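Job type: complex structure
Entries:
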Amino acid sequence: PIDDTVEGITGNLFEVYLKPYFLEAYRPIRKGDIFLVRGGMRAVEFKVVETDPSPYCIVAPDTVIHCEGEPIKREDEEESWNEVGYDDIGGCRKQLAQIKEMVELPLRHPALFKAIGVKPPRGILLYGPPGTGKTLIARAVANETGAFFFLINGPEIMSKLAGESESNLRKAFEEAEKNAPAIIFIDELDAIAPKREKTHGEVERRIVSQLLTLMDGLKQRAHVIVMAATNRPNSIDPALRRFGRFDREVDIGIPDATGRLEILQIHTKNMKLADDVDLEQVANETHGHVGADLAALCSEAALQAIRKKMDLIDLEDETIDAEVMNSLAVTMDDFRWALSQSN
Amino acid sequence: AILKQKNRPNRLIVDEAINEDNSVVSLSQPKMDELQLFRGDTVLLKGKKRREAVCIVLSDDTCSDEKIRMNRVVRNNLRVRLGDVISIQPCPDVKYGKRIHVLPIDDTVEGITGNLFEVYLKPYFLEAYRPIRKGDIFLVRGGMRAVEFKVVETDPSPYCIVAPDTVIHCEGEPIKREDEEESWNEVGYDDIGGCRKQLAQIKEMVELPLRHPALFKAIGVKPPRGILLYGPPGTGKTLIARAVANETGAFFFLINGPEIMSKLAGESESNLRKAFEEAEKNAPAIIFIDELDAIAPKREKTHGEVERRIVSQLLTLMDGLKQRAHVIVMAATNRPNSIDPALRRFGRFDREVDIGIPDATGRLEILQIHTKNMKLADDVDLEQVANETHGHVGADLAALCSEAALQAIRKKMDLIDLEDETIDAEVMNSLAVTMDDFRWALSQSN
Amino acid sequence: VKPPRGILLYGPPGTGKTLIARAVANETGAFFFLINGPEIMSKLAGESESNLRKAFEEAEKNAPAIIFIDELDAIAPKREKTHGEVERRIVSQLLTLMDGLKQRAHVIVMAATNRPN
Ligand SMILES: Nc1ncnc2c1ncn2[C@@H]1O[C@H](COP(=O)(O)OP(=O)(O)O)[C@@H](O)[C@H]1O
Ligand SMILES: Nc1ncnc2c1ncn2[C@@H]1O[C@H](COP(=O)(O)OP(=O)(O)O)[C@@H](O)[C@H]1O
Ligand SMILES: Nc1ncnc2c1ncn2[C@@H]1O[C@H](COP(=O)(O)OP(=O)(O)O)[C@@H](O)[C@H]1O
């Protein structure tokens, strides 16, 4: 096992995870592979450290599986446990395909731009209501392209004494440059760069100004894309749209029925769902909901299902166990219960 | 092998009292049948930390089969919270006591003079045949307060029935309140009325995080971490948060909105961060933010840049909450529109509860809570009071109950001063609050 | 039981609100501490707040006591009519002290203003 992926799990991991993964699947595997198994409301990772015959084989009913040894450290090994990817994003294929194509050359073929005199986009603005996956998108793109990611949180910047706010912005831009190819994501940009109509006082003006200066200095630091998120165009300072600052915009709207379904599948992929769970129904009835609503919904049904079973658990003096967690089905009733609350 | 049945039928989930008495527990009739217990039997209850208690069992027609209704006194004696499990068995062993020793808990009798013991203990035990256990702490109400006693010795030991013939000894050093686990002056769900649905929601919301925290190191699901309570002033939002902390055994840290804003800048922000660090170090914990709109108003209604910094500092701390296990932040305000809508983002205040104004039945319940330490004359009709206080909230009715108690005391202070009289436990406990006293309070304007 | 701890007197100027508070102190043998609204606000910030807290500490040490706040609206106006952040701090300091009053026996705070609004 990879250590961090099994922290907080107790019981026979190996029985609980490995058996249903391999059972009658005849998976071919290679020495050195890392693989991911889902269940018990989490995901677990294992390394294949040895195989016989070597260095590959099929894992068949007769194949014995040894798990004794020192757990593998997650830092020594290149895997994606808990790293957001495009497979973690649903319901917005077109816009993700645009962002992809936009950052392809700069992030994946950076050395190109020392050879040619064309300017890549350097600033992309993502619009859409809250909970629509704008942070997730930026992170996914960094991970999926191997780029460095630096998050700037809008509120965090503004929570500082003046000069500190400005020093922290500049530090962010210096760091992305030193680790480039890099994406700088500015969460809640409108906290930092509102319009002049809605500005109050002069530290606030200084800080929008500092941001625009840094955006203008971006063409001089290769190969940094700045992505930034806000509720709508009208919030923010329109000077941010100037050529060579945020010169590209993407509208991340609200998912439709098919997108919601996809979102629900993503947010239930670590769960055991009973046969009566009809995610298509759930998707059909959640009109107007966004990705954060449906993740909240999935968490709420999982937790209702656990509360049901904690009583029975405490009645028999039971401790919570990998076996317990993995056998525990979330049912349609659990989802119906979450769908019927108001909050 | 060393066997013992698992899934025993005498293990029950503890649930709230409907009948408020220190000596009674309630099961469902089918459970009693199954366990061969009968109405009025003595039962021995086992809880956490090897604690035991003795009680009278009754049938309740709303108790679920797997549950037991017990009041807060008994729970503390057992070291259980609502939702924990106990075991129950017959105790037909229990004899009329020859003698018992009790001591008062010190803070609970500070400021009372006269024969406490006569005034409190006699009416508590008189012809009630209460079973009691050595080590029990119990609460007695009267004379506009509540008093606590420990049972330090019993004969026969370690339990008996307190019967007419039972002698009660009270000489000794008073017990210190710090050495002892009881709820004098601690707000609980029994101190809250008229909002059952919303309290049941909050309960279920915080159940797993506060009561089963180790769960969340095992699973990758996110619990709610921020709950916002809406409703007019005086509606018990602070009381609710406190009750939930107490009833779940969680640490409570109150942040007062005005107090934060009364500081020099940087201090306000340092004080917020300190609050969040403290709750983390003592977690499971609830942070309650009283008058949140003092701290995090909307940008339309902001004035200047220390005020922006301070909303910003709060949102940053809320975002850091997923990194500090297992802290719920509850916060209170007059309505959604007051506050900064960035507080509603996923992973900040992602749950809202509307604590509205109680109805007639809720008011009645509120009035009963706020008169439980008083002697009320027979003519006191709390249902009338409840019917006529349309639109009032919990703070209005508590004020009303205080105002009637005080009017009743002013009536009697004159007669008291006419005879050179000093105020006494005896005086306070015999002093009835009457309907006239409540009618008088109902007829003022303030 | 909780006694009232704060009483607000409304009415036009010249209607004897200061006189009433003083009369009540004298007639009950209570200590009287007058806080003048304008006087508080005439100070550097921090001083205004220190002076409020000092007033409340003094009434507590000499209790039973009445604190009378003359021209309260100089000190604690509505948020619509507030200007700037020393003014917010000072209303805030007052509300904090009022909340601390249940912890200091036996202090009534009386305060005077032209109207609720
Ligand atoms: N399109 C989506 N697919 C899957 N999950 C999503 C999607 N949109 C939002 N979510 C979920 O809801 C959460 C809201 O996250 P976030 O990316 O912070 O929203 P935003 O940046 O737009 O406020 C995400 O972390 C993810 O869990
Ligand atoms: N639902 C209720 N049940 C019993 N008492 C209540 C209720 N609501 C308010 N009160 C009483 O009125 C007081 C008002 O308290 P508080 O909880 O500070 O109100 P809020 O937080 O909504 O302003 C409480 O301390 C309690 O004495
Ligand atoms: N009801 C009253 N009876 C007698 N004198 C009064 C009355 N009201 C006001 N005055 C007189 O007018 C003065 C105005 O005083 P003050 O109490 O400062 O008014 P306020 O506090 O309402 O501004 C008093 O000092 C007293 O001389």
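Summary: Chain A has three domains: 1-68, 82-253, 255-343. Chain A touches chain B at residues 7-10, 40-43, 130-131, 153, 155-162, 188, 191, 198, 200-201, 203-204, 270, 292, 295-296, 299, 302-303, 306-307, 310-311, 314-317, 320, 325, 341, 343 (CB under 8 Å).
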